[PDB]
Design a protein around this nucleic acid. Structure first.
Ligand code: MG
Ligand code: MG
Ligand code: MG
Ligand code: MG
Ligand code: MG
Ligand code: MG
Ligand code: MG
Ligand code: MG
Ligand code: MG
Ligand code: MG
Ligand code: MG
Ligand code: MG
Ligand code: MG
Ligand code: MG
Ligand code: MG
Ligand code: MG
Ligand code: MG
Ligand code: MG
Ligand code: MG
Ligand code: MG
Ligand code: MG
Ligand code: MG
Ligand code: MG
Ligand code: MG
Ligand code: MG
Ligand code: MG
Ligand code: MG
Ligand code: MG
Ligand code: MG
Ligand code: MG
Ligand code: MG
Ligand code: MG
Ligand code: MG
Ligand code: MG
Ligand code: MG
Ligand code: MG
Ligand code: MG
Ligand code: MG
Ligand code: MG
Ligand code: MG
Ligand code: MG
Ligand code: MG
Ligand code: MG
Ligand code: MG
Ligand code: MG
Ligand code: MG
Ligand code: MG
Ligand code: ZN
Ligand code: ZN
Lengths: 77, 91, 63, 50, 251, 112
RNA sequence: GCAGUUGGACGUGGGUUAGUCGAUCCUAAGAGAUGGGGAAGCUCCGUUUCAAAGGCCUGAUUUUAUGCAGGCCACCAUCGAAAGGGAAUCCGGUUAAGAUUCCGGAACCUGGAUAUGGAUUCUUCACGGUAACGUAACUGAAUGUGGAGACGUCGGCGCGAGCCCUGGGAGGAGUUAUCUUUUCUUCUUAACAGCUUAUCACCCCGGAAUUGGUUUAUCCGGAGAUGGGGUCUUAUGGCUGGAAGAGGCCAGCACCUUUGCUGGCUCCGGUGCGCUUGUGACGGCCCGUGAAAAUCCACAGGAAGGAAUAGUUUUCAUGCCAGGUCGUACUGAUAACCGCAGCAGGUCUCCAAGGUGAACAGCCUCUAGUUGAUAGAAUAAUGUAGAUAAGGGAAGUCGGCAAAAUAGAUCCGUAACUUCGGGAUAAGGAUUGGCUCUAAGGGUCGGGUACGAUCAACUUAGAACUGGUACGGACAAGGGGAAUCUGACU
RNA sequence: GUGGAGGCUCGUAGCGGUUCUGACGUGCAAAUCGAUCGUCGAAUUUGGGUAUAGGGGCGAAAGACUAAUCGAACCAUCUAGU
């Protein structure tokens, strides 16, 4: 329900002790008629709100996935 | 252009109710729908809200008045009478 | 097809009219369009400097 | 009415439970004079007026 | 016979007043201490229209001298009164339009309104549009003031009684024709149910004394004694004279 | 050209039963009820909508912060800026003239 | 009221899931206790009254529970709206039958506990901005004030939403003797949250006659206009999250079967006196000026409480718990209501496609829904309903009853009388189709400090040509005039 | 020219109920059906709530209406009234 645009906030938020589940949604988008690209959405489920981080760069998305905690239950789709 | 010879604002009644009644109504409708000069702001903005209530758009002041005019002759006469009596007991 | 012919100007004579001229297109609508045109032009010109405010005023109230 | 009082609903439930024929073992009883259910009500024939 | 329409209004079922949109009773301020020893100042906040009433009302705000509070009062507005005007009420107040002086402390010829006929009734004589009371004279011993009321009557009332100086606003209201049954309908929609009026002579004799007949006619004299009873009093009750008024009232 | 129903059990076009037609992710038109619109808070003096204050229904003012309901001036969320200016000026000048009325009388009494 | 294998019939069962929808609560007109007073009395008045008419904050004590310590405050029952007021929910899916109630997902409010982070303080209870005002927060009791709640009707103008219309493109279906880059259809995006967005309004600078700005509608300006620059309400709209993972349209490959499984597309625009609806700013009308209360907030005030080796704040953020009772199926009517009944009657309201056309008129059609009403065979009289009739044209009849005639729109032309407003569509006449053209009426961009390009409207007028002189071609749609009696009119 | 007043007007929905003295008149109906008509932004129409109760109410007045009942309702009793 809220979008975040800071990755350090997202990492801090994944370690909030009420956060049990997260999701990684892959979308196929278009920047223009030349190049279609691969968008990633990291959705973390708090108690009151769902927080969504939109990463358009697969390189940053790959590192952000590795940087997740192991106690966090992650769903790819 | 001139659309009516003599009925004026009473053309909204057409041929009904009588000419004598329509003349009386015209005389007072012109007054109550007119604009009047504000004694406070000095502008031509005083209009009737309801019978006896005259409000200015500028300065937002509201004066109690006549039903179809801001001031009756009797009220002007009373204003002057009271001014004369007030200046009579102190002087 | 009928609308395309209406565009070309057909099916519009006196025998295909059942409402008044005002019912079909009100004089108030025509007036409003016309004044809006004239006032928009006058304001364009006053801004561009093709016309001064003193001519703008008399032309505004003439329009 | 759909928006109704509990009282009216309660009386309607009693009427739904009354809207029954006879059991037929009651007709086999010793010294039985009940043939049918005379207090039978239908929504089309007679209104409850509650 | 049947109970007639004028007998039927006293029960007050459909004949009561319609007081939904009335802002309150138009009363003078209670006569406490300041209004009989000095003056108290208040301020006119708005002049509002009162349903069922041609005269406008003024919402005047005074201060409570005994508690921190801002008691509001509903005056009948006098002609010339305006918003933000300071109203002064009491014994030692100044002879200006809108002030609530006593009648003893005003000169003769003074035009007042909303006059107490007894001190502390908080509003009586000269309350309607354009109406005013005139002071005529004084009896300082036997502390009394003679006044001309709008009817033409002369009345002796206490000098301690109060009145608002000036004329009640809304004057000239009855000079305009209504022209329309509908205008009368809307007039009486907010006052009470007293309109339209059926003529008793257009009725049956069960419904009215003047009812009946093969022509519309009253039959007996429409002048009814004061000692008649309810059901008989339909016409001109206790009429000293009758007919078109030819000359001065000689009062 | 889909047609919609009242989504509650009041079938009457009352103020509390205003509907807006809205298209849904299922593609269909649905009526959704709209709450009554909010009136702006007004100055006690002039009666004009005083700016800076959020426009809400009365109970919704309890859900928002103090910053949404006031401005940082005296009489902030109650009176207009110019009305506050007027009463400041009035207070200062009337108190000064009270002092002046006092010393005039203090002069006259010492004189007589 | 024929039939019946069917049924609102018969028999047997199943079925109505809520913190967010209502009730519940508020007050409205009004009803109605108490106190008191009447009345032989059943009971009547009256509703704040001639009454000794109550409960609210904070603690102090630490036998201890809660009195006394204090202070505060004075409305004086209660009932009264499933259309008025009102804390809070949406999408998708699911059943034989339930859904804003169930499942999934995503939110919000109230009430209560509460810890952390953040903010604040050694100038104790924050900073910035000339200002309008702004911000994540950034003490505040009694008492007081103010606002919201909270408000007519009509008219036109503006804006938005949905709908209608429509271009391109991606898909499916239909027609295809011939023509048709063709006809139909899908291409959707909630509540909520964040950033941004506005008419009115306001601020600063500045100082206006050669008067200017300006609305469709004429009002505003030395009580400070035009102008330049800004602040604000966030109705509403845009972007993002929600959210494509959903739903929709398709293709392909699978099977006694639970049956699926796998891939794709779900895009970019435009137009308007359009329809409906909401809203804004205005104007008009009134001897009519168009509810109240619960409830919430703000302000004034400054009681009281508070920091430095440590405190205070819980209108900022996050986190924890709970949210009762009742209703909820279905019809809402030529068969579920009332009329003795499965009666052509009556019975409150919302949504509302295309064409013709002034038009939710009449006529035709799409979506959706019905195809019900005892039938068959014949076509005598008399009927009911609909119609047509040569010549005449009210001779009929109490009486032109009934029916006919007229009828739309454009142009012309319009008398007596008159309260000068009307009469008046007076009367009375002409024209109207189809086709091919012509003319006129517009928006957006462009110019060192006259015009060109581009885009799109239905409105009017006119000319040729054409026809078995037809053309408001069906539908729709005034007969008129001269006079009297009478009631002024609605 | 603008503007858009009106207990104005033509005319739908609706409210009413003129004339056919039409249909029906053991009816579809203890008041309907059809056509023709009045009016259609207001003294309009209308739901719900509330008040007025029988010699009483309510009545723009017809002795109208007050549950198919009105120049005095309905129910029971006096009453097997005379
Ligand atoms: Mg032409
Ligand atoms: Mg039109
Ligand atoms: Mg015009
Ligand atoms: Mg009446
Ligand atoms: Mg009579
Ligand atoms: Mg008599
Ligand atoms: Mg008589
Ligand atoms: Mg008679
Ligand atoms: Mg703000
Ligand atoms: Mg603020
Ligand atoms: Mg049968
Ligand atoms: Mg059978
Ligand atoms: Mg009582
Ligand atoms: Mg209650
Ligand atoms: Mg309610
Ligand atoms: Mg209301
Ligand atoms: Mg409600
Ligand atoms: Mg269902
Ligand atoms: Mg759920
Ligand atoms: Mg700060
Ligand atoms: Mg208010
Ligand atoms: Mg208005
Ligand atoms: Mg979106
Ligand atoms: Mg919502
Ligand atoms: Mg300015
Ligand atoms: Mg919004
Ligand atoms: Mg509507
Ligand atoms: Mg249900
Ligand atoms: Mg249901
Ligand atoms: Mg249903
Ligand atoms: Mg219905
Ligand atoms: Mg239905
Ligand atoms: Mg029935
Ligand atoms: Mg019955
Ligand atoms: Mg058309
Ligand atoms: Mg409609
Ligand atoms: Mg049509
Ligand atoms: Mg039949
Ligand atoms: Mg003959
Ligand atoms: Mg009609
Ligand atoms: Mg009929
Ligand atoms: Mg007959
Ligand atoms: Mg017969
Ligand atoms: Mg009503
Ligand atoms: Mg008679
Ligand atoms: Mg009857
Ligand atoms: Mg016998
Ligand atoms: Zn003024
Ligand atoms: Zn102000």
């Amino acid at each position: 329900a809220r979008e975040i645009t800071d990755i350090k906030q997202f990492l801090e938020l994944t370690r909030r002790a009420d956060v049990k589940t997260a999701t990684v949604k892959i979308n196929k988008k278009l920047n223009k008629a030349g190049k279609p690209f691969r968008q990633t959405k990291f959705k973390v489920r708090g108690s009151s709100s769902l927080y969504t981080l939109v990463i358009n760069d697969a390189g940053k998305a790959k590192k952000l996935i590795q940087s997740l905690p192991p106690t966090l239950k992650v769903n790819r789709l | 252009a001139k659309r009516t010879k003599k009925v004026g604002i009473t053309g909204k009644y057409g041929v009904r109710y009588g000419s004598s009644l329509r003349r009386q109504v015209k005389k007072l409708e012109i007054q109550q729908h007119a604009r009047y000069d504000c004694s406070f702001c000095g502008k031509k903005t005083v209009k009737r809200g309801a019978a006896g209530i005259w409000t200015c758009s500028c300065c937002k002041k509201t004066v109690a008045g006549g039903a179809y005019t801001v001031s009756t002759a009797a009220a002007a006469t009373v204003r002057s009478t009271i001014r004369r009596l007030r200046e009579m007991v102190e002087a | 097809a009928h609308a395309q012919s209406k565009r070309e100007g057909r099916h519009s004579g006196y025998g295909k009219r059942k409402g008044t001229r005002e019912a079909r297109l009100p004089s108030q609508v025509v007036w409003i369009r016309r004044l809006r045109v004239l006032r928009r032009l006058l304001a364009k010109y006053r801004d561009a400097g093709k016309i001064d405010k003193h001519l703008y005023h008399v032309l505004y109230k003439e329009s | 009415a759909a928006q109704k009082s509990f009282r009216i609903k309660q009386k309607m439930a009693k009427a739904k439970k009354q809207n029954r024929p006879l059991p037929q073992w009651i007709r086999l009883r010793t010294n039985n004079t009940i043939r049918y259910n005379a207090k039978r009500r239908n929504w089309r024939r007679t209104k409850m007026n509650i | 016979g049947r109970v007639i329409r004028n007998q039927r209004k006293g029960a007050g079922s459909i004949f009561t007043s319609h007081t939904r949109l009335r802002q309150g009773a138009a009363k003078l301020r209670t006569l406490d201490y300041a209004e009989r020893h000095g003056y108290i100042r208040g301020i006119v906040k708005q002049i509002v229209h009162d349903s069922g009433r041609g005269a406008p009302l003024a919402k005047v705000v005074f201060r409570d001298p005994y508690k921190y509070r801002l008691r509001e009062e509903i005056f009948i507005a006098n002609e010339g009164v305006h918003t933000g005007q300071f109203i002064y009420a009491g014994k030692k107040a100044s002879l200006n339009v809108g002030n609530v002086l006593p009648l003893g402390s005003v000169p003769e010829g003074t035009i007042v309104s909303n006059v107490e006929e007894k001190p502390g009734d908080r509003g009586a004589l000269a309350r309607a549009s354009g109406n005013y009371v005139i002071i005529i004279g004084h009896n300082p011993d036997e502390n009394k003031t003679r006044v001309r009321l709008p009817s033409g009557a002369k009345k002796v009332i206490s000098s301690d009684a109060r009145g608002v100086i000036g004329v009640i606003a809304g004057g000239g209201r009855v000079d305009k024709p209504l022209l329309k049954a509908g205008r009368a309908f809307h007039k009486y929609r907010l006052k009470r149910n007293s309109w339209p009026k059926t003529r008793g002579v257009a009725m049956n004799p069960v419904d009215h004394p003047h009812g009946g007949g093969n022509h519309q006619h009253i039959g007996k004299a429409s002048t009814i004694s004061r000692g008649a009873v309810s059901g008989q009093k339909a016409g001109l009750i206790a009429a000293r004279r009758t007919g078109l008024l030819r000359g001065s009232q000689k009062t | 050209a889909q047609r919609v129903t009242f989504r509650r059990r009041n079938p009457y076009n009352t103020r509390s039963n205003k509907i807006k037609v809205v298209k849904t992710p299922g593609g269909i038109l649905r009526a959704q009820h709209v709450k009554k619109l909010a009136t702006r808070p007004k100055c006690g003096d002039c009666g004009s909508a005083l700016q800076g204050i959020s426009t809400l229904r009365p109970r919704q003012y309890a859900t928002v912060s103090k910053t949404h309901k006031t401005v940082s001036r005296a009489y902030g969320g109650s009176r207009c800026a110019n009305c506050v200016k007027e009463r400041i000026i009035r207070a200062f000048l009337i108190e000064e003239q009270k002092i002046v009325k006092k010393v005039v009388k203090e002069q006259t009494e010492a004189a007589k």
